[PDB]
Amino acid sequence: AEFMEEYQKFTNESLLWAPYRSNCYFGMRPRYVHESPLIMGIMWFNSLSQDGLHSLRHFATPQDKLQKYGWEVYDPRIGGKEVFIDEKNNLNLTVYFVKSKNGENWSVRVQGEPLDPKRPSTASVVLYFSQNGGEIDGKSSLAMIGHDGPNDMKFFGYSKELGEYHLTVKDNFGHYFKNPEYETMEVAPGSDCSKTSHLSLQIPDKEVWKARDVFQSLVSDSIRDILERPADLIPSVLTIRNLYNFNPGNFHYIQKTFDLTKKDGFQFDITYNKLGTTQSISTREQVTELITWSLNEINARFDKQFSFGEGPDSIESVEVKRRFALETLSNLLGGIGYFYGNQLIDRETEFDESQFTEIKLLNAKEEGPFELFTSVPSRGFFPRGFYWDEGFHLLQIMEYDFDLAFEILASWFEMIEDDSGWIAREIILGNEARSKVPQEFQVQNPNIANPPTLLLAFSEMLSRAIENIGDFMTNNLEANPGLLTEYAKKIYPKLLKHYNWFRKSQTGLIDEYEEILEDEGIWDKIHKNEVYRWVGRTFTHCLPSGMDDYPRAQPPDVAELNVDALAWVGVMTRSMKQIAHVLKLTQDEQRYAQIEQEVVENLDLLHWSENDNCYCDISIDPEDDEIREFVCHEGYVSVLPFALKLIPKNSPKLEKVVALMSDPEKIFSDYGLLSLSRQDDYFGKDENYWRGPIWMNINYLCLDAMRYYYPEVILDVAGEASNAKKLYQSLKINLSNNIYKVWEEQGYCYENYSPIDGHGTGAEHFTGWTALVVNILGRFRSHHHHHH
């Protein structure tokens, strides 16, 4: 326990400070600080135009249509470099983040330059800071204590949680906008674009996220005052000022308007030093060497974890492939955020498992606070925790930073409350998070489950730890049985609660079929307790399966048994077996081992269709009742038993699944595996999400499964390619080539890809499970054997 607290202390300190407000282009708050956090964000716009406030950047949104934004290099333990290309605002913005070795001090360098040096424009950068908590704790504060000329400012702050600190904003260079042939640029007292403007005021903690709206509102009131006039005084008109004579408070705006016709651009530093620190960040030169050191250290960590060769993809060079992989991983890590607040949950409205109409949640309530440290599918579209997405994020994160993956996993399972094992599918905390979500999707339903991909990720992590440790650094939990055992003892009761909850809530009705299964002569050899159905499906959708519009049995029936629901129970059971092994719980381990084998046997006995050579959902013939029908829509659901490694090794069924995945007339394409066979009735129909398009998450599992079932495919030996090798190689090549190409051309990683011509579709900046392309390119010997 003492060793664990020593490890957890260091982990905490290394992850305390980072740009964890991932919904912002650049926003910061300290990890796990909910009462008195220092909150920071950066906004910018072109103040030279009359309607520059309409192009004010703050939150990441696809509606901004930036040419490019994201981390080129990033690791939240260290820092990184983020770039924003904004053609509308003529701005080429780079933001560096670095930290002291103990992680308690930090600096942000904002560096801008024009995209076109002869386009008349300005870069009006607005920093805001808020020391929260004062209204609650009666002590937390942040005050400007002085300045060195107009453009360098010194602040003193107190956070009850993090202690006293100094915050400084200082210019290194940059030409402030001004017409030299005027006596002054001022148009009103405080409205002067020729120097830094600062405004302090009191904003309630819960309203701090509205920094852009408050800014626009205050500037609008100043404009109203002014006009109740040359074009080059507009920047001064759009400079914030203390019009209403607010008393100083927790919140601070700092506005700097630079002339973008000067080619060299600008640079200023924002530095935070804990009071009494032995590692103060003190000079511009010190920041410059920290940035150089930090970027090198991240490149070194990346090179230790991944390795890249020439081929088999067609990416022009190994240097370019590696850089692509680094940027993609950096954006996945850069989506990691810290969230705190209430969910909207409806527990009162009655749930009827035998009805299939959409449900009206009319008894919604504020519940919480909750908190969560998690990666996100997309900073623009989906800047929040998604339960089923996170398992896939962790499969990528774990390959780079094993211990970080354990931090995120633990955070998720902290959300399990005492009376229930339920975890919401989508985690929306507070008004800031709700602002990105249509009201119709905000209210969560505690009767609805989702695929437990977190436990698939946990299974893969425990597999590596168990392999490496034998008998019972960013990978201490992989190598140290003492540390792993303490982590496991803490989390076990939570996983168990979740496991029991999932199994009960999704229990199928085996008692129908009995007469039918007796007639087939297999009723006696199936395991009646291991059959499952997705509870809460509707006529046209099945949200609990994670693949909403993947075709299901019609009409819906309470006797349906879903092959993918059973497969997921298999995966959960496997993870329980592994954590039981780690805890030396022999009798529990052997129970889970047998349950896993019973899942395996039910998949082959019940869900395998000899006629269709496929795993299928099953249902009772609505006409006949004496007949049970195999609902067979060939696609991701059909391959899931393969992709989750539940089919017995050497099973004759393996070859048929491989044949399914290799067939160009079904789900094989030049751009990866299609979610649904081209020959299916539903292919291309309706919203067309899981009815054709290629998704990286399932594609990656299939590749991983190939290596498990056909271990020879990992060797590239000259000779005759087996069917398994042909598939493995071409799929890996097709995914790598296409995801890169779309990223190179269309700009970024996408939620899914077109079966037509492989073009990117769905949400943009999807890192996101599409970041699993990093592993496909660079993963090497994640398994641990022996090097005698």
Ligand SMILES: *[C@@H]1O[C@H](CO)[C@@H](O[C@@H]2O[C@H](CO)[C@@H](O)[C@H](O)[C@H]2NC(C)=O)[C@H](O)[C@H]1NC(C)=O
């Ligand atoms: C590691 O950091 C976290 C900070 O969240 C600590 O684990 C919160 O700690 C408080 C007080 O111990 C508890 O009330 C909460 O229940 C904890 N939450 C979670 C999610 O664990 C932990 O104490 C820190 N350890 C060290 C050594 O700093």
Ligand SMILES: *[C@@H]1O[C@H](CO)[C@@H](O[C@@H]2O[C@H](CO)[C@@H](O)[C@H](O)[C@H]2NC(C)=O)[C@H](O)[C@H]1NC(C)=O
């Ligand atoms: C964004 O601005 C940066 C900074 O100037 C540019 O990346 C300099 O570019 C040259 C040419 O590649 C290199 O010699 C330097 O190493 C770069 N410096 C840094 C810090 O990257 C980049 O070209 C600009 N991008 C756009 C689209 O204008």
